[PDB]
CSV table of C-alpha atoms (C1' of nucleotides) and ligand atoms in Angstrom, one decimal:
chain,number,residue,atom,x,y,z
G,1,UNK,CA,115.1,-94.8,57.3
G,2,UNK,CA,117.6,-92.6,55.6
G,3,UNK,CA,116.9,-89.7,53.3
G,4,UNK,CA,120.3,-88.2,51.3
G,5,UNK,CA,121.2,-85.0,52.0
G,6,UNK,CA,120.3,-83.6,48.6
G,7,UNK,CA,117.2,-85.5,48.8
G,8,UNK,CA,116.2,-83.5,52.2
G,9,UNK,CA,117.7,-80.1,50.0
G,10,UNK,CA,115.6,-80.5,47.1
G,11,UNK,CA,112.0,-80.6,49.7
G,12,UNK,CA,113.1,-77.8,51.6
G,13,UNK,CA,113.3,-75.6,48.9
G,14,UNK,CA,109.6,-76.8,47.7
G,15,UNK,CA,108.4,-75.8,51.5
G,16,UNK,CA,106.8,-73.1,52.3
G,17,UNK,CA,104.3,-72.1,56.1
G,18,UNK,CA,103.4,-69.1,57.1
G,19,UNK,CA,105.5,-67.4,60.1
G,20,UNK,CA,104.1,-68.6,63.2
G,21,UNK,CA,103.1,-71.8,61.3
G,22,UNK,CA,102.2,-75.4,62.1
G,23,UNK,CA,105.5,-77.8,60.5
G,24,UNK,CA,105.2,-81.6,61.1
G,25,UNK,CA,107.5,-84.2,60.6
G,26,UNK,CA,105.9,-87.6,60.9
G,27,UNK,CA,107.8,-90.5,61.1
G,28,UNK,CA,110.4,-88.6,62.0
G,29,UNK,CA,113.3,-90.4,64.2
G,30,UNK,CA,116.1,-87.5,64.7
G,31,UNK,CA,113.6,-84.6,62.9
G,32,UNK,CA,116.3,-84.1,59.3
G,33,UNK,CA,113.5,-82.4,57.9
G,34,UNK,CA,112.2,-80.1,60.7
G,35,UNK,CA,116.5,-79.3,61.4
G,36,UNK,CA,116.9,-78.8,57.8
G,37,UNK,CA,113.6,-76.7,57.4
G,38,UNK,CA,114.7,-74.5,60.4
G,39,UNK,CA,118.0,-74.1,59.1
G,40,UNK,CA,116.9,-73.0,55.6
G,41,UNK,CA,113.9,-70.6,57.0
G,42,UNK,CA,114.5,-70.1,60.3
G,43,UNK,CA,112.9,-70.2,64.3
G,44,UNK,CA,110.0,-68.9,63.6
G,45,UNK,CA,107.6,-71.7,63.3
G,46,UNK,CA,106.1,-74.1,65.6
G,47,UNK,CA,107.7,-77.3,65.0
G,48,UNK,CA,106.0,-80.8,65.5
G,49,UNK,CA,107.7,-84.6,65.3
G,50,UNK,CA,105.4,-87.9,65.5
G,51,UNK,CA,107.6,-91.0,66.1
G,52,UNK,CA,106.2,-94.4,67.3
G,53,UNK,CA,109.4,-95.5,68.5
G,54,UNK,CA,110.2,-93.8,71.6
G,55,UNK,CA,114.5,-95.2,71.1
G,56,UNK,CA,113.7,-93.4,67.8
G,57,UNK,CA,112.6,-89.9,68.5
G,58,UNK,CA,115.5,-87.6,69.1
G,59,UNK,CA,114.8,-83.6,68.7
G,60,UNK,CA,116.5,-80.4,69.9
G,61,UNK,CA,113.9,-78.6,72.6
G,62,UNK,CA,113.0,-76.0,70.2
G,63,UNK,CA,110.3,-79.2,68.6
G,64,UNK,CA,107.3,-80.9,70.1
G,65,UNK,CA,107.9,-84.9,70.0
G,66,UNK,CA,104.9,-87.1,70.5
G,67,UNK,CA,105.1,-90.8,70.5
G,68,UNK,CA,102.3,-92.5,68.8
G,69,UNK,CA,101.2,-94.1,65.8
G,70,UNK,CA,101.2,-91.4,62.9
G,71,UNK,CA,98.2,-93.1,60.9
G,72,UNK,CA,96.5,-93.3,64.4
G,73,UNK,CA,97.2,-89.7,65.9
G,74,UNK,CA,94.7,-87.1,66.2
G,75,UNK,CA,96.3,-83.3,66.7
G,76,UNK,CA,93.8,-81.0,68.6
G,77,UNK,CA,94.9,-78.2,65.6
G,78,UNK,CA,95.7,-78.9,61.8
G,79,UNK,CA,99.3,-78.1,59.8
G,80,UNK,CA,100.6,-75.7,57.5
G,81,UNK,CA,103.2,-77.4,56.5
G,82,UNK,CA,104.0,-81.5,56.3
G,83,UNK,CA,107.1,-83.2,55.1
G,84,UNK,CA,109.4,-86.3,55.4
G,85,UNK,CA,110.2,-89.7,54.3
G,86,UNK,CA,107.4,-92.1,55.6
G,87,UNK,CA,107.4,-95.2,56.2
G,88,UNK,CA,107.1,-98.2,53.1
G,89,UNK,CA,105.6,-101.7,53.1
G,90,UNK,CA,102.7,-103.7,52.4
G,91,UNK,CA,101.1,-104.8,56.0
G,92,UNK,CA,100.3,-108.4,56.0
G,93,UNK,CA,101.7,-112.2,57.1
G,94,UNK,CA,105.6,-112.0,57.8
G,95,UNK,CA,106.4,-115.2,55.6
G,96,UNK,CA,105.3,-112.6,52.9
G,97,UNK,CA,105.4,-109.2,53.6
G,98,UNK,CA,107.6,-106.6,55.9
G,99,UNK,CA,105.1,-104.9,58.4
G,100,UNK,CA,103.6,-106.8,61.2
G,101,UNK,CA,100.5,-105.3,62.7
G,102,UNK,CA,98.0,-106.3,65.2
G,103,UNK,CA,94.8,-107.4,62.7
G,104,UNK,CA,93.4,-104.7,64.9
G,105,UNK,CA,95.7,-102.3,63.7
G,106,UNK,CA,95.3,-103.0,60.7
G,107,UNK,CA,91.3,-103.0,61.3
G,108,UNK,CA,91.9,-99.0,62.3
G,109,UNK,CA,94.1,-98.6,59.3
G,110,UNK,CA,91.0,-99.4,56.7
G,111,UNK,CA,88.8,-97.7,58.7
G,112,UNK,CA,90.6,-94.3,58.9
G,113,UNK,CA,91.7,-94.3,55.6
G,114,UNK,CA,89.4,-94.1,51.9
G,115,UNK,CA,92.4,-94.9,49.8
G,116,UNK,CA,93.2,-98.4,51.5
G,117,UNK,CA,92.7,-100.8,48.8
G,118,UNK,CA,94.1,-104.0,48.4
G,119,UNK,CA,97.1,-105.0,50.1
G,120,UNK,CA,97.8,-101.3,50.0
G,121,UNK,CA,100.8,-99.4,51.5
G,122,UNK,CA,102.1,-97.9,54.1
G,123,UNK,CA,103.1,-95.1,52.3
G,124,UNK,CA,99.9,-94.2,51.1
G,125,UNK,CA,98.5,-94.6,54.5
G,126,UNK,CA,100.6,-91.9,55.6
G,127,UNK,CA,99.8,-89.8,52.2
G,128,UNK,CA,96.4,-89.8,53.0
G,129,UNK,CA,96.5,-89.2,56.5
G,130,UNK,CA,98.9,-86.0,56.1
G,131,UNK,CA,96.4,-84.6,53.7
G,132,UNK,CA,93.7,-85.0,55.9
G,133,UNK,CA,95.5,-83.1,58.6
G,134,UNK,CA,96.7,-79.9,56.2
G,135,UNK,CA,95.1,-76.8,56.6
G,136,UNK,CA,93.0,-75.1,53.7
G,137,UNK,CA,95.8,-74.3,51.2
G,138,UNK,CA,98.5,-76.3,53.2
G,139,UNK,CA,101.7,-77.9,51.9
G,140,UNK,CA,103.1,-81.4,52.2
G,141,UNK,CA,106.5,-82.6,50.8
G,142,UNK,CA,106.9,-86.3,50.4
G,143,UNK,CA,109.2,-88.8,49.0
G,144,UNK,CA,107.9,-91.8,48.2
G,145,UNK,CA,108.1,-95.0,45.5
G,146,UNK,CA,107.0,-93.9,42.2
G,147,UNK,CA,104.6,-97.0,42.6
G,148,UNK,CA,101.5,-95.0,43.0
G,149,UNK,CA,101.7,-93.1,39.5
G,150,UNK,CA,100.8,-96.4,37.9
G,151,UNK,CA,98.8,-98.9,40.3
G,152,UNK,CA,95.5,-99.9,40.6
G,153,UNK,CA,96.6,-100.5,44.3
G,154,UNK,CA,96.7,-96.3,44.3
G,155,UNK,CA,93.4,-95.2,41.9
G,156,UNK,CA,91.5,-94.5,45.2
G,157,UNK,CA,94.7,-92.3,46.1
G,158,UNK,CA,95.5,-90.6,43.4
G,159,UNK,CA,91.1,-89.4,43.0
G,160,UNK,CA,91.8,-88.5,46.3
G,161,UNK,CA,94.3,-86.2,45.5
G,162,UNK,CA,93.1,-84.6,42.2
G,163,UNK,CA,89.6,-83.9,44.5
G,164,UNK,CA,91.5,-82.7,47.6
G,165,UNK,CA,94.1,-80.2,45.9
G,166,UNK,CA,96.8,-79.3,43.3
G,167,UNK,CA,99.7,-82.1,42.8
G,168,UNK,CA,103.4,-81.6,41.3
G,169,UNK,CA,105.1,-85.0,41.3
G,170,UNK,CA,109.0,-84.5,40.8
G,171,UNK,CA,110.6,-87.6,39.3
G,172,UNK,CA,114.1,-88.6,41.3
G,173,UNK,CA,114.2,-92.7,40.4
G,174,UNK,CA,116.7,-94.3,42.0
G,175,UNK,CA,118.7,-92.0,44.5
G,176,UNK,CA,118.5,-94.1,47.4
G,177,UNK,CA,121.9,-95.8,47.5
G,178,UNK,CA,121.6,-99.5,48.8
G,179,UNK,CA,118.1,-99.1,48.6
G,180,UNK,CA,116.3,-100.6,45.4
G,181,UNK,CA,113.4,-98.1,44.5
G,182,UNK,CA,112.6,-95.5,42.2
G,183,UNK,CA,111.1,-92.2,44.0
G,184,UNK,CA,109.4,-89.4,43.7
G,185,UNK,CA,108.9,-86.3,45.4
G,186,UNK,CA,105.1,-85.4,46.1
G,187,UNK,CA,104.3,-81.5,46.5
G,188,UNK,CA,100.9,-81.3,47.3
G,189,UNK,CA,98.6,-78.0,48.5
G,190,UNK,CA,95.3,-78.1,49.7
G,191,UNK,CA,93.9,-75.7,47.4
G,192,UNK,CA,93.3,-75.0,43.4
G,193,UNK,CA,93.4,-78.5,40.9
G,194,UNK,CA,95.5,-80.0,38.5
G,195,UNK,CA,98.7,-82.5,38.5
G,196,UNK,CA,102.5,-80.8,37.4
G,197,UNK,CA,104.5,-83.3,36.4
G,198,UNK,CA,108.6,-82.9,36.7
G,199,UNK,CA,111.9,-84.4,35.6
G,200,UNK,CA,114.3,-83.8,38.0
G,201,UNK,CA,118.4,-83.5,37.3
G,202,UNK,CA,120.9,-83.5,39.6
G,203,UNK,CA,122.6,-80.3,40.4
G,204,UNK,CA,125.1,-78.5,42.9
G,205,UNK,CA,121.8,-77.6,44.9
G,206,UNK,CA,120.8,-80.9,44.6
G,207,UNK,CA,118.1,-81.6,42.3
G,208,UNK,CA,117.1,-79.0,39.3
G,209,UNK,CA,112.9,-80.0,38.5
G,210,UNK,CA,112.3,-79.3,34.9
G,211,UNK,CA,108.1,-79.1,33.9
G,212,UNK,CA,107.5,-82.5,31.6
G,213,UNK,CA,104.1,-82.0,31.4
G,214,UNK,CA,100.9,-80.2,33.0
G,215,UNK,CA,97.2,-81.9,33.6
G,216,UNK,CA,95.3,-79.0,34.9
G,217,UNK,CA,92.0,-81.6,34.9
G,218,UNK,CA,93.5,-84.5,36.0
G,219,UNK,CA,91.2,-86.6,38.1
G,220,UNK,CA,93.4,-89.2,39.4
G,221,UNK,CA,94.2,-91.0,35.9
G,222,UNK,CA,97.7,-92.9,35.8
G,223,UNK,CA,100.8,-90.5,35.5
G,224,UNK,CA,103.1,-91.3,32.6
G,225,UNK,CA,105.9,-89.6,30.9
G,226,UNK,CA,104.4,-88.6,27.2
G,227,UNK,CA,106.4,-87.3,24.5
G,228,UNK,CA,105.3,-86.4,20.8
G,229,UNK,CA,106.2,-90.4,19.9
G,230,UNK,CA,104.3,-91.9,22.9
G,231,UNK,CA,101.1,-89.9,21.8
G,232,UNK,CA,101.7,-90.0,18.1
G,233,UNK,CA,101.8,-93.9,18.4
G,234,UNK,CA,99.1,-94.4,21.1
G,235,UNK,CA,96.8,-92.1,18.6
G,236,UNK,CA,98.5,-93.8,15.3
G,237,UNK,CA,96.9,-97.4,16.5
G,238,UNK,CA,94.2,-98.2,19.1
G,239,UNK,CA,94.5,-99.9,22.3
G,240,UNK,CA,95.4,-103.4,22.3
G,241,UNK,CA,93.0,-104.0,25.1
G,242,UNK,CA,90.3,-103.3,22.5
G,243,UNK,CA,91.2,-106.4,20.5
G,244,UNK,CA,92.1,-108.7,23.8
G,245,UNK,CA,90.5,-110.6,26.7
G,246,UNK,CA,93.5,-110.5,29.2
G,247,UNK,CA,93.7,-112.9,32.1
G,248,UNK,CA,96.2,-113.7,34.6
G,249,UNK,CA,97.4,-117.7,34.7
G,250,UNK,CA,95.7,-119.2,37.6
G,251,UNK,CA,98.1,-119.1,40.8
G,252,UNK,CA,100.4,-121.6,42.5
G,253,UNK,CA,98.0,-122.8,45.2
G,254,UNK,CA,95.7,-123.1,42.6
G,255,UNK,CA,98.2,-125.7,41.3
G,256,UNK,CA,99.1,-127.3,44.5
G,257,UNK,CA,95.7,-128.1,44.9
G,258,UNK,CA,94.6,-129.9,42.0
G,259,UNK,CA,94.7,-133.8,41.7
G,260,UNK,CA,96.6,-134.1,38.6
G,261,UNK,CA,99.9,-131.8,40.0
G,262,UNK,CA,103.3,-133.4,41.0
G,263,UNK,CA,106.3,-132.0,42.3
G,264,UNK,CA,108.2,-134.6,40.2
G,265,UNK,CA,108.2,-135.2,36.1
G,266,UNK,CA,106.6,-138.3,35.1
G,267,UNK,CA,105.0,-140.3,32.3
G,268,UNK,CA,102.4,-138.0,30.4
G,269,UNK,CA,103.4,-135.0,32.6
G,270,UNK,CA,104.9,-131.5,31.5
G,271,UNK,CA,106.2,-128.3,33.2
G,272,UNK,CA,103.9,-126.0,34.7
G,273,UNK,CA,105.7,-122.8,32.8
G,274,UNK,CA,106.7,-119.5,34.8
G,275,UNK,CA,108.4,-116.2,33.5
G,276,UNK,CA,111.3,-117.5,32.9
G,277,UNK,CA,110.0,-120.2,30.3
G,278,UNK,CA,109.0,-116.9,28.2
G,279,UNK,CA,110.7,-115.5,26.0
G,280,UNK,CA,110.8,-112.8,23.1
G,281,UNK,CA,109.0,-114.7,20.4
G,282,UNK,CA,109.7,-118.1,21.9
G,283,UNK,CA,108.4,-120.4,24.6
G,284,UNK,CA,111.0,-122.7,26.6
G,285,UNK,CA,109.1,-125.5,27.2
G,286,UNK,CA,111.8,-127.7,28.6
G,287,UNK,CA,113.6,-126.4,31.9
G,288,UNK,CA,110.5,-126.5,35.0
G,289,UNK,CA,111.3,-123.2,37.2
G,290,UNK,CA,108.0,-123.9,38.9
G,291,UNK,CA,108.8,-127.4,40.7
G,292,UNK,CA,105.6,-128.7,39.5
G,293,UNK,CA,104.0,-131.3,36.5
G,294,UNK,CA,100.6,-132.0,35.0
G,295,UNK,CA,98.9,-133.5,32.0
G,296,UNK,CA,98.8,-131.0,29.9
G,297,UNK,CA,95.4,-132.1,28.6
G,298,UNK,CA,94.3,-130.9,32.1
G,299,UNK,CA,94.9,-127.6,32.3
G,300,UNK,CA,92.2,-126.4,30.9
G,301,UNK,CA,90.4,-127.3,34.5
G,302,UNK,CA,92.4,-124.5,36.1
G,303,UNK,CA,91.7,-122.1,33.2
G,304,UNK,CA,89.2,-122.5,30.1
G,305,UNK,CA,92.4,-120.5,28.2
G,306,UNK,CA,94.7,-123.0,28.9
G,307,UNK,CA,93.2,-125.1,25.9
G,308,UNK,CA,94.0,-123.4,22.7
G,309,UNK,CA,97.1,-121.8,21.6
G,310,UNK,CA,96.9,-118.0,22.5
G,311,UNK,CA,99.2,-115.1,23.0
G,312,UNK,CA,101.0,-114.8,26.4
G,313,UNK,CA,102.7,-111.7,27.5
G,314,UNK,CA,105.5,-111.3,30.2
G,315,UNK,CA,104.3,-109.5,34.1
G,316,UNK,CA,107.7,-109.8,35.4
G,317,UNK,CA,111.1,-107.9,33.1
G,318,UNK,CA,110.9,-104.9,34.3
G,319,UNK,CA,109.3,-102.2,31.6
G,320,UNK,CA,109.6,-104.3,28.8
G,321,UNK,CA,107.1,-105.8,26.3
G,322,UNK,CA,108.1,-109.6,26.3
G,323,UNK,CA,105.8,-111.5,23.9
G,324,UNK,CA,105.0,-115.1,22.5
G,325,UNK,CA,103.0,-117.4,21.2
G,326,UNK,CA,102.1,-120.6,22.9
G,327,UNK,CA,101.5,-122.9,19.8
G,328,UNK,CA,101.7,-125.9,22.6
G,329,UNK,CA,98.7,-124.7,25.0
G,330,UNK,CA,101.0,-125.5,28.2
G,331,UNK,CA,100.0,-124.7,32.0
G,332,UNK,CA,101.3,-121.5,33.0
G,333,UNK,CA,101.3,-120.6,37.0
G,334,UNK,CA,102.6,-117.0,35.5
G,335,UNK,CA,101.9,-114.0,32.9
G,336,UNK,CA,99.3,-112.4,31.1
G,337,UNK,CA,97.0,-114.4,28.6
G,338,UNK,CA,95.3,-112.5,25.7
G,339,UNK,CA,92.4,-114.2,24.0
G,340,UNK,CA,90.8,-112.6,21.2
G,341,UNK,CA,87.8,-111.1,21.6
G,342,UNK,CA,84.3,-111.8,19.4
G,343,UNK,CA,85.1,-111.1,16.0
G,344,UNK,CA,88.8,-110.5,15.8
G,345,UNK,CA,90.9,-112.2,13.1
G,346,UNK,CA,95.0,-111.4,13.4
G,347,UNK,CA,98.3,-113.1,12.6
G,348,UNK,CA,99.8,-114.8,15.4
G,349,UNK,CA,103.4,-114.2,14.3
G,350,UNK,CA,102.9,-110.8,13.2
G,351,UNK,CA,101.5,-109.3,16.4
G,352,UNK,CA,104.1,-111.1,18.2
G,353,UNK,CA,107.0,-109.3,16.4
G,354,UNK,CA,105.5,-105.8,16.7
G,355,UNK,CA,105.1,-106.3,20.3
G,356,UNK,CA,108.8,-107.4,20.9
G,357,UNK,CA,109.9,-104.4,18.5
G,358,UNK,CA,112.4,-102.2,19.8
G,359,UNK,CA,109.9,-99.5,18.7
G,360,UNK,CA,107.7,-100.9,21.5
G,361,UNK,CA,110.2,-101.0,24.3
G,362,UNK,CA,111.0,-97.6,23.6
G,363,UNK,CA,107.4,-96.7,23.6
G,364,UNK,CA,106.8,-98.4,27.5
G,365,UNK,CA,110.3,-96.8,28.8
G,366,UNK,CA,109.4,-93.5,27.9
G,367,UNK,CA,106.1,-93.8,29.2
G,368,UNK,CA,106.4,-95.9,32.6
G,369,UNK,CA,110.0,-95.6,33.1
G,370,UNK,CA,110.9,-97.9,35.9
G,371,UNK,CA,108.0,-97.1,38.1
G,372,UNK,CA,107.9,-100.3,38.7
G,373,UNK,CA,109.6,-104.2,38.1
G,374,UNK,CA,105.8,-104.9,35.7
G,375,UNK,CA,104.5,-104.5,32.5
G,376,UNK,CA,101.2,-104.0,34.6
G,377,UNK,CA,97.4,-104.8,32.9
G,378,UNK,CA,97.0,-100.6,32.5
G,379,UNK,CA,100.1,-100.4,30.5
G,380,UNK,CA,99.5,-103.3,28.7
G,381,UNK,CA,95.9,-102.8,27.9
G,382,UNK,CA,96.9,-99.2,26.0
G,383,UNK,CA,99.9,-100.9,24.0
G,384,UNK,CA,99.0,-99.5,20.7
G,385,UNK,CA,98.8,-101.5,17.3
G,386,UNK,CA,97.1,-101.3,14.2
G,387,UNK,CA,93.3,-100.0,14.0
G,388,UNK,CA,91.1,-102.9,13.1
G,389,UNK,CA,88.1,-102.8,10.9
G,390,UNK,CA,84.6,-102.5,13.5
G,391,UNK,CA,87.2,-100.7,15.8
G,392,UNK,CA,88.9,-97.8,14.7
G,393,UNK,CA,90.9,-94.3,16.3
T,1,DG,C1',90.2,-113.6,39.7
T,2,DT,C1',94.6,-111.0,40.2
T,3,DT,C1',97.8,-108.0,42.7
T,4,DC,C1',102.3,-106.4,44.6
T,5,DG,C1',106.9,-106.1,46.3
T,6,DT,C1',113.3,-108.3,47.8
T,7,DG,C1',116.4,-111.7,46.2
T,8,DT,C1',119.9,-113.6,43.5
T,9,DC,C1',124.1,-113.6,41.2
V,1,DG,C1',121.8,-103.9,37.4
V,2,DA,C1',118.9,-107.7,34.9
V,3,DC,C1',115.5,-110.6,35.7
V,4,DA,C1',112.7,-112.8,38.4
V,5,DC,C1',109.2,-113.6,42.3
V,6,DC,C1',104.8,-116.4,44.3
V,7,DG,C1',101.5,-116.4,47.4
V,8,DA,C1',98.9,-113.7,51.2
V,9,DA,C1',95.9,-110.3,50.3
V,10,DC,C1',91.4,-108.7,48.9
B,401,LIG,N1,111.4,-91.0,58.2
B,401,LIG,C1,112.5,-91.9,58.0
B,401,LIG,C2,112.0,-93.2,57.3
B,401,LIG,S1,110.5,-93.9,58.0
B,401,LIG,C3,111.3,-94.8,59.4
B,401,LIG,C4,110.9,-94.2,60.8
B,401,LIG,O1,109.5,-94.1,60.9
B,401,LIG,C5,109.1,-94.7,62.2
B,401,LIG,N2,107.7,-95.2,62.0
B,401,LIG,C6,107.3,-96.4,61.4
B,401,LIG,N3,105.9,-96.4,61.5
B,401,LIG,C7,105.5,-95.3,62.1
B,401,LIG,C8,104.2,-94.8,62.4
B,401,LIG,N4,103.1,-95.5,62.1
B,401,LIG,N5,104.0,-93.7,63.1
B,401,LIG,C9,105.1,-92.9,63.4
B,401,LIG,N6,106.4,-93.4,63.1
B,401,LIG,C10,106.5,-94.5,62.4
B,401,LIG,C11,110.1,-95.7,62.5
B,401,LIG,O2,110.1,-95.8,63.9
B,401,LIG,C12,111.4,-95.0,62.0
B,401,LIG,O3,112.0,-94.1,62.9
DNA sequence: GTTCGTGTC
DNA sequence: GACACCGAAC
């Protein structure tokens, strides 16, 4: 609920309104951005707050405070000028996830908003929503998780965005102290095309944005951080996704259902494997992190995969490529599985070591950064490796 | 069928 | 700060 100073610095100086202009905060507790944005430009604006806490809302008289439900709110008169720090957090069951809404609420929420997809997000909830309340060639000024560059949660988003106007995403990672997430500032203007994508370093000022790379026809395509190497390589090989069938294992209710599970080891009964039986070029098929058992003959009921001996590659180690080969054909309640697709011959043990090279690390860091705690299926699907014969670059 | 985000030490 | 969710959500 706290944005650093130099956080709040760095916005301001993206903002811009017209004199006279509409500038709304939402979400916006004390105002930091509507006091900072006055200070930096001065009175002549009209300023606006939306807070849905009325203990929360707290601004000088020169701002207009409403108390209401952001996503929910409809102004009689569009802005020039949006910024702030919304909100974060998947809306769903408390055992689970952080925000608890009325299924009601939530009803409105994927009614009012194109982008909802999946569990979705708060925060691109509020995206959305400020975009659709931005005058013709108005400017918002977000920070949010870096999350949406890279997941499929966000595709309906980020089309939204490349349709709607012209993007500049300013990398900040992780600046939040105490708080475990990598931003990113959105500047968005309704008007013209194109993504701008930044580096940002810090600086006396704050932050000092230095152009990475421009897409002046991107249409809502991931956003990654290439470099000569990353596109060298990616164009060097072809996509491993061209080679590979990848599936997810089959989940733990899944498990908990089935006849044959225990939650003790038996007789005839092996660990049902998690991340943490994977390893770089090795499976640990001894310690159970899962707390369950099965025959291992019949895990092929959960999965058709789970029969054969087959590549398995790690969802959860951050921005890594973690890779093995499972010669036993164990039950997995975790990671990606990669079966071959018609026609494909390769070398178990030599696609496993270029996929745990350093080379390849290197290649995903650069590119994805730490976006997010995943190797995700769209990163993994583009890893690159050698061109094969019926399938070339 | 598979996605996504603090918890732990 | 490295290494992990795991199951409610669609
Ligand atoms: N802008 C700082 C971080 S977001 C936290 C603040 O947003 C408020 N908030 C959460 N959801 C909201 C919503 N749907 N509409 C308006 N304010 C909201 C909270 O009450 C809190 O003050």
């Amino acid at each position: 609920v706290e944005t650093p100073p130099e956080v709040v610095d760095f916005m301001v100086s993206l903002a811009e309104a017209p004199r006279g202009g509409r500038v709304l905060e939402p979400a916006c507790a004390h105002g930091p951005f509507l006091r900072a944005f006055r200070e930096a430009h001065g009175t002549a604006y009209r300023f606006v707050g939306v807070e849905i806490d009325p203990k929360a809302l707290d601004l000088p008289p020169w701002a207009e405070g409403i108390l209401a439900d952001f996503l929910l709110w409809e102004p009689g008169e569009a802005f020039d000028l949006i910024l702030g720090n919304p909100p974060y957090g998947i809306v769903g069951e408390a055992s689970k996830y952080p925000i608890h809404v009325f299924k009601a609420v939530k009803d409105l929420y994927k009614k009012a908003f194109s982008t909802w997809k999946g569990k979705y997000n708060l925060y691109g909830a509020f995206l959305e929503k400020a975009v659709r309340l931005l005058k013709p060639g108005g400017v918002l000024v977000f920070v949010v998780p870096a999350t949406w560059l890279v997941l499929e949660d966000f595709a309906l988003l980020r089309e939204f965005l490349a349709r709607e106007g012209k993007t500049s995403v300013y990398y900040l990672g992780e600046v939040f102290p105490q708080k475990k997430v990598s931003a990113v500032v959105i500047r968005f203007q309704k008007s013209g095309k194109g993504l701008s994508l930044w580096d940002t370093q810090e600086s006396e000022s704050g932050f000092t944005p230095i152009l990475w790379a421009e897409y002046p026809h991107w249409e809502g395509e991931i956003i990654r951080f290439e470099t000569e190497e990353t596109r060298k390589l990616e164009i060097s090989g072809m996509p491993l996704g061209d080679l590979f069938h990848i599936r997810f294992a089959a989940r733990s209710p899944e498990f908990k259902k089935h006849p044959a599970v225990r939650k003790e080891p038996g007789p005839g009964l092996v660990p049902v494997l998690t991340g943490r039986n994977l390893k770089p070029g090795w499976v640990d098929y001894e310690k159970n992190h899962s707390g369950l058992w099965m025959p291992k003959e019949r895990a092929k009921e959960l999965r058709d995969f789970y029969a054969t001996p087959h590549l398995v590659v790690a969802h959860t180690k951050g921005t890594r490529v973690v890779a093995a080969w499972d010669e036993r054909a164990y039950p997995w309640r975790e990671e990606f599985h990669l079966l071959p697709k018609e026609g494909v011959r390769l070398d178990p043990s030599s696609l496993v070591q270029w996929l745990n090279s350093e080379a390849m690390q290197k290649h995903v860091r650069t590119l994805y950064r730490d976006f997010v705690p995943h190797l995700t299926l769209r990163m993994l699907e583009r890893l690159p490796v050698r061109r094969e014969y019926g399938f070339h670059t």
